[PDB]
Amino acid sequence: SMSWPSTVWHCFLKGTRLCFHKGSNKEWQDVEDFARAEGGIHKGYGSDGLKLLSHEESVSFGESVLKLTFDPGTVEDGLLTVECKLDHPFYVKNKGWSSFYPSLTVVQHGIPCCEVHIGDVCLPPGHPDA
φ/ψ of 126, rounded to 5, equals 75, 5
Under 8 Å between Cβ of 91 and 114: no
Helices (H), the chain: 31-37, 102-109
Nearest in space to 31 (alpha carbons), one of 130, 127, 124: 124
DSSP secondary structure of 15-29: T-EEEESSSS--S-E
